[PDB]
Amino acid sequence: PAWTTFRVGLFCGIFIVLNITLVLAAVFKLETDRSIWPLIRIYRGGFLLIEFLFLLGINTYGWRQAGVNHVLIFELNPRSNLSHQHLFEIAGFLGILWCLSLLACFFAPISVIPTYVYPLALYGFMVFFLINPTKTFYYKSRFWLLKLLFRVFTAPFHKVGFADFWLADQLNSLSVILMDLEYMICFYSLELKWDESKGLLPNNSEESGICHKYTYGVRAIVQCIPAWLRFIQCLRRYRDTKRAFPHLVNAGKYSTTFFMVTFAALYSTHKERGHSDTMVFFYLWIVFYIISSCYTLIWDLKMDWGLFDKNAGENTFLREEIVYPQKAYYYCAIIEDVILRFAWTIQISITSTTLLPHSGDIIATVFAPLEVFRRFVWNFFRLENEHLN
Amino acid sequence: PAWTTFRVGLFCGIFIVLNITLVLAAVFKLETDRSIWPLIRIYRGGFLLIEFLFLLGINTYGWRQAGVNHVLIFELNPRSNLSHQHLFEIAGFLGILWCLSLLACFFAPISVIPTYVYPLALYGFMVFFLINPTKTFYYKSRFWLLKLLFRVFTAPFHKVGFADFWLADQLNSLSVILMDLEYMICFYSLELKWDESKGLLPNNSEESGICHKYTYGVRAIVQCIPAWLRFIQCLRRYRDTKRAFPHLVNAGKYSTTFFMVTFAALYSTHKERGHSDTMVFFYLWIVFYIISSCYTLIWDLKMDWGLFDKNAGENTFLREEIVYPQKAYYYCAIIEDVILRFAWTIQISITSTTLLPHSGDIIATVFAPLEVFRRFVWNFFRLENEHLN
Structure with missing residues (x-):
């Protein structure tokens, strides 16, 4: 309706000005010698969620105007679903809390409330928004x-x-x-x-x-708990369906992450601590890492997208499938996935084991909003396939 | 459409945050000994226009959802008219320029561009928006x-x-x-x-x-040039229509302003300059002023509104007319006009002749956004009558 679109604009406008205020306060009110990296490492866990929900608003917009009909396969009420403006304004509003809390961390109010509570005010009000009875x-x-x-x-x-x-x-x-x-x-x-x-x-x-x-x-456990839950979820789907090819290959692409972060963590604790002879000892676990990233990339590019199949595929589109519901421009980006899958797996190795502590809050802080954009591309090119298949 | 309502929200959100930034900069970056009154006296002439256009957006909203049908009597194209969102977003966008220019007056950029140009950037870009070829x-x-x-x-x-x-x-x-x-x-x-x-x-x-x-x-000439043009406009309508009662009574309510400001200006220049014996000499020109304000108030409340007429008026509504197109609540405010007509005429006497120089930038700065709100009330209760008559 008109009020929801007005609130989309209102929250986007307040988000834009508070983002400009955030950049201006980070430049012209820079810290003298205090470390900004704990502040970045706490507020990144709100910024990624808000960027995910704003890109999910673009995702629902893309599914709405391409014949995807996501309400059929998400098992939702088709009379009362969530349009893309509702995701846009939820993302905007949580962005307003995030920018206000980070400005409270920059511009500290009076001494009765110290600067540490504002991140708890942020995450606590996000949770209280989530579990509102x-x-x-x-x-x-x-x-x-x-x-x-x-x-x-x-x-x-x-x-x-x-x-x-x-x-x-x-x-x-x-x-x-x-x-x-x-x-x-x-x-x-x-x-x-x-x-x-x-x-x-x-x-x-x-x-x-x-x-x-x-x-x-x-x-590493808190790292791997999404990959672990998705692994057990795919194993439960194997217990239900008992079909091999969409399941064990799907279970492999998270078992690879479960192995890779664990082996990189043992590399990290056997580099600084103990015998530092691992110059060729875990060099095989970067080729294994390359195979474990290309495995997820080929799975991302062949069966959940179906994106190039010479078996009953259309001849003049080697980039795309036999029939495609997105329109002609904004092409099926194999490039924005072949780069950002690598960016995500560099980042997921960096920000858990801390291989490079001097770059552990810059490489991760750059590549994680890029891996959210990779997942944004994934949502388009997976639900172009689930509607078709 | 959806994009115009989104831009309404976007400009309103940027306006709200830049207004909060304006208040916070005026409080916590207050001037030491520099006079803020030239800055207020220049930027009030943008703030009143933007408040007028935002209230005009509310005006077109009120005419749209009350059966006024303002496109019939404004002589517009009914297929392509201006909805209330378009006025809202024009008002919002000019508010974005106003708030950015006033923040540039507070937070001065580098020494190549001094702080004086930004008001000319404001008013020049408003004019360039107006006469875009x-x-x-x-x-x-x-x-x-x-x-x-x-x-x-x-x-x-x-x-x-x-x-x-x-x-x-x-x-x-x-x-x-x-x-x-x-x-x-x-x-x-x-x-x-x-x-x-x-x-x-x-x-x-x-x-x-x-x-x-x-x-x-x-x-005083630049003061009275709207009243003068409306006086000559009503005189040209007398030359065309040649009907006495809606015209000469309408010409009187601006001839009274034309006399009142001139007599108050001669009071002001014969109080500080020359013989200051005018303690009872122009005391008759405050009773004449009271009559000249009640004349406009009765004209505002009796014939352009038709608001209480015992000749063929509905019995149970002494407040309103025989048939009313606004709904039951948000009543026909005689109070918000009987106060703010007085507020407008105090202000119009103050900010031209400068009777009270210590309060000439506070009384005027308070009462002028109130007289714009009085004109906002006037738009509702005049076009409830022009559609009817």
């Missing part, structure tokens, strides 16, 4: 999201539909949200002593932010 | 506005329709725009010497901002 703030759709999350986070005993699989593949590109929540727990165990001045943005002494209980231990 | 930025409607302004500012030889009269009555509440343009000419003749530091916001020495050529002279 009976209010009108998306009662129908968000409780479907909560039941979906309950069925996804408990992978056994629940038969997977499509929306279960779809959002379990959405956690595959939003693993950094769980990483940043775990880092927020680690940082607030590090700096619960308030001093009433700076909870966030500590001094140039990092106070051992890389040291914790079970170094490269449970951090 | 062939671009798509409202080609159809704004050239109708330009031909309307050419027919209004040249009152003889042009037969008045309704839109001519309507916008000539819109200059009756936007006289402060002409005052602030004249003050901008006076201030830039005062401070054309740049010094590359502060064109706007001079030091506590005002450098004789009340002294000019023909003190209380041509300033």
Whole structure:
């Protein structure tokens, strides 16, 4: 309707000006010697979610105006569905909270409320928005999201539909949200002593932010818990359907991530700690890593997209399939996937094992909004196939 | 359409955040000893226009959803008219320029561009938006506005329709725009010497901002030029129609303003300058002023609104007329007109003759966005009558 589109504009406009204010405050009110990297590592876990939901608004727009008819296969109410403006304005509104909380971290108010609470105000109000019991703030759709999350986070005993699989593949590109929540727990165990001045943005002494209980231990577990839940979900689909080719090949592309991060974590804890003879010892686990990324890339480009098949494919479109529901321009980007799958797998190796600590908050902070854009491309070119198949 | 409503939201959101930034910069980046009053007296002539156009968006909304059918009597194309969102987003966009220019006056950029140009950038880009020759930025409607302004500012030889009269009555509440343009000419003749530091916001020495050529002279002419053009326009309607009661009574309510400001200006220049014996000498010209304001108020409440007539009026609505097109709530406010007509006439006496120089930039700056709201109420309760009569 007109009010929802007006709220889309209102939240996008407030988001644009507060983003410009964020850039201007980061440039002309830069910190003297305090580390900005804990602030980036906490607020990245909100920025990626908001960018995911804004790109999901573009995703629902693309499915709406291409004959995808996503309400048939998501198992939704076709009379009362969620249009793309509703996702746009939810993404905008959460962006307003994110920008206001980060401006509160920059421009600190009076000394009664220190600067550390504002990230908890951000994430707590996002959760309180999510589990609002009976209010009108998306009662129908968000409780479907909560039941979906309950069925996804408990992978056994629940038969997977499509929306279960779809959002379990959405956690595959939003693993950094769980990483940043775990880092927020680690940082607030590090700096619960308030001093009433700076909870966030500590001094140039990092106070051992890389040291914790079970170094490269449970951090890899919080890393791999989306890949693990999607692996067990695909195994439950194997227990139900008992069809080999769409399942065990699909289970392999997350078992590869489960192996790769674990082997890179043992590399990371056997490089700094213990015998540092691993110059050729884990050189095989970068060729295995290359195979484990090309495996997911070929799976991403051949069967969930169906994107080039010489078996009953149209001759003049080697790029695309036999029949395509997207229009002629905005082509089926194999390039934006062949680069950003590599970017995602470099990043997922970097921001968990901390191979490069000097670049662990720049490479990850650049490549994670690019891997969200890769997942944005994935949504178009997977639901051009699920409607067809 | 959806894109225009999205732009309404976008411009309203950017306007809201830049307004909050304006308040925060005026509070926490307050001037030490520099006078803020030239800055207020220049930017009030943009703020009143933008508030007028935003309230005109609410006006077209009110005429659209009450059966007014304003396209019949404005002599417009009913297939291609201007909806209320278009006025909302034009008002929003000009608000974006106004807030950006005033933030440029607060947060000054580098020394190549001084702070004085930004008001000329504001008003020059507003004019360049207005007289855009062939671009798509409202080609159809704004050239109708330009031909309307050419027919209004040249009152003889042009037969008045309704839109001519309507916008000539819109200059009756936007006289402060002409005052602030004249003050901008006076201030830039005062401070054309740049010094590359502060064109706007001079030091506590005002450098004789009340002294000019023909003190209380041509300033009263620029004051009374909307009332004068509406007076001659009503006289041309008397030359055409030759009907006495809707015309000479209508001519009287602007001849009263033409007399009142002139007599108050001679009071102002015979109080500070010359013999200051006018303690009872012009005391009759505040009772005459009271009669000259009640004359316009009774004209505003009896015949252009028709708002209470015991001759063939409905019995249970003493507040309203026999048949009313607005719905039951949001009543026909005689109170918001009986107060704000007085507020407008206090203000129009203050900001031209400068009776109270210490309150000449606070009383005027408060009461002029209230007189624009009075004109906003006038638009509803005049076009509830012109459709009926």
